[PDB]
Amino acid sequence: MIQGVIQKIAGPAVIAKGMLGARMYDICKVGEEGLVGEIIRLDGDTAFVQVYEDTSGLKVGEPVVSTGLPLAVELGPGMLNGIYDGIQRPLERIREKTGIYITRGVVVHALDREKKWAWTPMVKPGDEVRGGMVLGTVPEFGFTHKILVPPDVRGRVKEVKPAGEYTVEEPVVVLEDGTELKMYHTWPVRRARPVQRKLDPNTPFLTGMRILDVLFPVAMGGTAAIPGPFGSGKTVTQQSLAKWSNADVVVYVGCGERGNEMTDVLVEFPELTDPKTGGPLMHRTVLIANTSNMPVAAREASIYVGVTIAEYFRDQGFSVALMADSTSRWAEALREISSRLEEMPAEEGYPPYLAARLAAFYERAGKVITLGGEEGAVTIVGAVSPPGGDMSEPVTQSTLRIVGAFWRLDASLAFRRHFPAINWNGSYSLFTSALDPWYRENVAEDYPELRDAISELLQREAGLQEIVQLVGPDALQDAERLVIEVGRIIREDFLQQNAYHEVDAYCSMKKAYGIMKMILAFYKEAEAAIKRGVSIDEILQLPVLERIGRARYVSEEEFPAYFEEAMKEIQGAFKAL
Amino acid sequence: LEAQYRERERAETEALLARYRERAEAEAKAVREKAMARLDEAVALVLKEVLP
Amino acid sequence: EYTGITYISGPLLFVENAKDLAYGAIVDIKDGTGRVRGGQVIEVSEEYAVIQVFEETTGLDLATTSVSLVEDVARLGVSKEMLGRRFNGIGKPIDGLPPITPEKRLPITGLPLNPVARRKPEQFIQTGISTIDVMNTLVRGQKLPIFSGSGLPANEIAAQIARQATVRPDLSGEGEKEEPFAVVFAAMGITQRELSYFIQEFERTGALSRSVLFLNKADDPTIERILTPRMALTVAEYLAFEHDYHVLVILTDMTNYCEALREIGAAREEIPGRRGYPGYMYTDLATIYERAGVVEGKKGSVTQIPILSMPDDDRTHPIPDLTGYITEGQIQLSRELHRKGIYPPIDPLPSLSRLMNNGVGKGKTREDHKQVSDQLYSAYANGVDIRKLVAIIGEDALTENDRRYLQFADAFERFFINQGQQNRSIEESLQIAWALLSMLPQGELKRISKDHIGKYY
Amino acid sequence: ELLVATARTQARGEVLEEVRRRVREALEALPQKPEWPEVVRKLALEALEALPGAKALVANPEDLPHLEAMARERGVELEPALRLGVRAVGAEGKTQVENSLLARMDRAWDAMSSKVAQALWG
């Protein structure tokens, strides 16, 4: 097979020679330890080696013998429960065979090769397969993890090994096409599981919050983003997707997030309760996260490889929740390519590949009917930041702001008591007009009425914000201080939510319904109060101001009877005066 | 009134389609029957431009 | 073969033996993956060329580098059976009819309209709306950009006006048979929802058997982005000038069009431009827009409406500047309006259409129209000055005139600007204007003559 | 209106692909015909006259009988493996222009699609 040794070793810009029958964007083995590179250029006999695992003594004259796959992902069980890399290695095994250290040139397994999983025959040699047909149902813990045939891979069965456990490397179904269907099988990520068509979402997804679901909804099959410049409490919205989400299957991926920000988040989850089971959250999460601790080249690959792991579960009949944790980490990897290759990036601190390798991953999956005729819906809430600090830059607008929701953030925003924060003005919703059916029926039939009437004040307040920074209002009038104080409490207690407690966050229909009507009512009753000649001073010093102040320290369970008692204290302490 | 106007319209947006289908198929046949006579002539024009 | 492969980093390719190749050519590349891919041949020399692969770059190998010459000349069909189909991208089967119909193999750019063969506007179109057809007449071959923001859905407010738009030159003495409603649409880099939300509007009520879609998904390569317009561009020429039909080109998202472009030019040794966006934009952007304007003796001509995005409609980067020299007018979007659900959101004094009375006259859109069109400019703009100031000027000074001008506004945004997805014509869109002004006295009406008042009040 | 377009296009298809059936049956039984030298020789003519310098005008070996004459006018002929074409190879590298009856057939409903529609319908 493919020959060649090192010509020029020069850290991560290594130039091999003698490369014949090589092919672009293909995994290899380079060095004597094996660091695991990828052909990111060919130039005759010489090829730009991209060097993942760090170099420490690698030299001239070492193997460069090409595996000949294009970062092919091993599909088959073992994934559910575990810590994986963005090009697939289990960090369980690295830690178990080295130390607490990550040693360079130590490549562990691709998936499993010492684990065995129960095979139940569900096909026979009498029938034929097609792409997106069940070969059997393997049981991996509390979830149900079938095996499928990738599409454009099809034949007529020819054997099926009987009931028993079998190692994953082996086949268990063989076909009359020179192919054998395995529980460890290479599938390109460059031709990641085909679908029938792009569809329009119309069923919302919920994080169990009152601001990311309420004023500006997210969709199932969606795309979204929540930029918070240079960190601003944008990592906390994954303590909200942690055990309050409605995602059947979590698939948490980070490009190359820095260790310290995924020290407490990373080990937070096996400790956490599983809403879809009860034990560790890792029954539903896969966790294919890539870190700075993991290879610096691995970060570049990461997104376009980790999309395919989202797709294998999403295909089967699952409503997978994929989150790329801060896409700006991917931009820092993408733009480094230029530096090492003697090319300049696209001018003015923008990455050379703009649309090309960003938009395509995003729109690869998200509410799409499949070839099996199943419904594959990938839900993302992009946890981005802007690369230039400006959001007028291409990569932001091209897929991170034409998204289904945008919430802006500031630095002094999140510092007060807001985590994860949203802006009061600067947050709009780009798709909500197709999510109204489902909200009407499932939640409450007057729900598209109650969110537009909260936002109406919340955002008209901006009207007054401007005149502050002008001459300043100093005409205290009743209809004046009506908007002011209302909206103020809406930012003080309703946008101030903590993803740290289950009484400051975690929401179900009746809680999300309730709170949002609580305010409206009190506001409503204030409108006709003030009109007669009741000063806003005396409205403020009521105990009912304190009830809204005690509607962020109340549990969901209690919420029902809590609200039913408080509706009477509203009408009493208002109409009467 | 609307009740007797919705069902009216339904029965007309069936009548209209029903006739479109009959023309379509008869004019599909008229593109078949026109070709199959001038069929050898096409093959001739094709053949003649592949074999140089 | 066609070897000489150097710098294959991403969708770049150099190859020697490009003495057989041309600029403006497209070629099949062979490899042992079994993938047959295109990509245009640019920056050519007797040795090294630049090819940018149709789909990705994963498959290129050293074994097979051969190129089956497709055609140096640029091939492009001129079609005439495409007046009621559906396609996404370059032209791929969605409705199961074949990509294009040949007549000719015309090039992609044949060179725009000769200026002495172009006549003045003398007719108008109607998009089913009030404020953008009464107050500002969208004329014949007009190039009117719609500057939209970011964080707002451009795309929906677009196609919304699709079904509403059915032309009304009734009042002039011409039909919609001598002015047909032909929607030729070319977007690029559109979302998975939005790309299906487009086809939804069309398929709703009958309007897809008189229009063609083309829309290059945000997951269809950046190479195909560019050619998408040029295709239906060259077909369009043959639609509206040589069939006497009347087309309306509605482009959407210019940001993607301009991003992808940049990558192409950066390898031909052309430096990018101000705030990174290219400076060789100008030429290329012209060629799409300049096939607009009427033509002597040929009644049918294409009306251009491009739609583009900016962060807040700020003019601090190329995307508006450029555009804003060849195109006339701008129509920006108000945050107030779109919040309250007043659609389409068109500003007061910030909005204006450069031509509005040289495509219409009196009795062609009604006679009173003349001075009604410059009433509601000065009349709307006055309520915007106390549309929040009613407690910033206290209850310690309050006057009749300006109070009445608050109530004017509320009814002007509700009834006049917004009119739902319900259809309107010139005569019904005129009715609304008069009615609301009827609250107001004769002494606050000043931009309309007593003659016009003696017709309608 | 859509239904008219679809039922006609379906009808129109069957006729083009059956015309293709009759045309491809003729090419499959081409070697049988004694008009096989006149065709083969003219195909390789454009080839050697074009981009391939005639380093080798590579042929199938049972069409080597029926082109040995113009081997002696240009090139040395030794396969595409279809038995219905001639590759040509040049001295530039290898170049590669393959004029196959199959290859000219494929680009002739995308390269003279106009001409077959005019002959059946007009």
UniProtKB/Swiss-Prot annotation, chain A:
Per UniProt, ATP binds at 228-235
Per the UniProt entry, what is one GO biological process? proton motive force-driven plasma membrane ATP synthesis
Q: Which UniProt keywords apply?
A: ATP synthesis, ATP-binding, Hydrogen ion transport, Ion transport, Nucleotide-binding, Translocase, Transport
The answer, when asked if ATP-binding is one of the entry's keywords, is yes
| Catalytic activity of the protein | ATP + H2O + 4 H(+)(in) = ADP + phosphate + 5 H(+)(out)
InterPro entries from the entry?
ATP-synt_VA_C, ATP-synth_a_Xtn, ATP_synth_asu-like_sf, ATPase_a/bsu_AS, ATPase_F1/V1/A1_a/bsu_N, ATPase_F1/V1/A1_a/bsu_N_sf, ATPase_F1/V1/A1_a/bsu_nucl-bd, ATPase_F1/V1_b/a_C
Stored PROSITE patterns: ATPASE_ALPHA_BETA (PS00152)
Q: Which domain of life is it from?
A: Bacteria
Top-level class of the enzyme under EC nomenclature: translocase
Q: Which Gene3D superfamilies match?
A: 2.40.30.20, 2.40.50.100, Bovine Mitochondrial F1-atpase, Atp Synthase Beta Chain, Chain D, domain 3 (1.10.1140.10), P-loop containing nucleotide triphosphate hydrolases (3.40.50.300)
Q: Does the keyword Nucleotide-binding apply?
A: yes
Into which family does the record put it?
Belongs to the ATPase alpha/beta chains family.
| Name by which UniProt lists this protein | V-type ATP synthase alpha chain
Q: Could you tell me which species this protein originates from?
A: Thermus thermophilus (strain ATCC 27634 / DSM 579 / HB8)
UniProtKB/Swiss-Prot annotation, chain C:
Q: Which GO terms describe its molecular function?
A: ATP binding; proton-transporting ATP synthase activity, rotational mechanism
One Gene Ontology term from the biological process aspect of the record: proton motive force-driven plasma membrane ATP synthesis
Q: Which cysteines are joined by disulfide bonds?
A: none
Matching InterPro entries, A to Z?
ATP-synt_VA_C (IPR055190), ATPase_a/bsu_AS (IPR020003), ATPase_F1/V1/A1_a/bsu_N (IPR004100), ATPase_F1/V1/A1_a/bsu_nucl-bd (IPR000194), P-loop_NTPase (IPR027417), V-ATPase_su_B/beta (IPR022879)
Family annotation (SUPFAM superfamilies): C-terminal domain of alpha and beta subunits of F1 ATP synthase, P-loop containing nucleoside triphosphate hydrolases
Q: What does the UniProt keyword field contain?
A: ATP synthesis, Hydrogen ion transport, Ion transport, Transport
Tell me which domain of life the UniProt entry assigns to the organism this sequence originates from.
Answer: Bacteria
Q: What does this protein do?
A: Produces ATP from ADP in the presence of a proton gradient across the membrane. The V-type beta chain is a regulatory subunit.
* Family according to the record: Belongs to the ATPase alpha/beta chains family.
Q: Which PANTHER family match?
A: V-TYPE PROTON ATPASE SUBUNIT B
NCBIfam families of this UniProt entry? PRK04196.1
Q: What is this protein called?
A: V-type ATP synthase beta chain
Q: Which organism is it from?
A: Thermus thermophilus (strain ATCC BAA-163 / DSM 7039 / HB27)
Curated annotation (Swiss-Prot), chain D:
Give the molecular function GO annotations. ATP binding; proton-transporting ATP synthase activity, rotational mechanism; proton-transporting ATPase activity, rotational mechanism
Q: Does the keyword Ion transport apply?
A: yes
Report keywords, A-Z.
ATP synthesis, Hydrogen ion transport, Ion transport, Transport
Q: Could you mention a single GO BP entry for this protein?
A: proton motive force-driven plasma membrane ATP synthesis
A GO term from the CC aspect: proton-transporting two-sector ATPase complex, catalytic domain
What family is this?
Answer: Belongs to the V-ATPase E subunit family.
What does the UniProt function comment say about this protein?
Produces ATP from ADP in the presence of a proton gradient across the membrane.
**Under which name does UniProt file this protein?**
V-type ATP synthase subunit E
**What is the organism field in this record?**
Thermus thermophilus (strain ATCC 27634 / DSM 579 / HB8)
What is this organism's lineage? Bacteria, Thermotogati, Deinococcota, Deinococci, Thermales
The full protein's residues present here are: 65 to 188 of 188
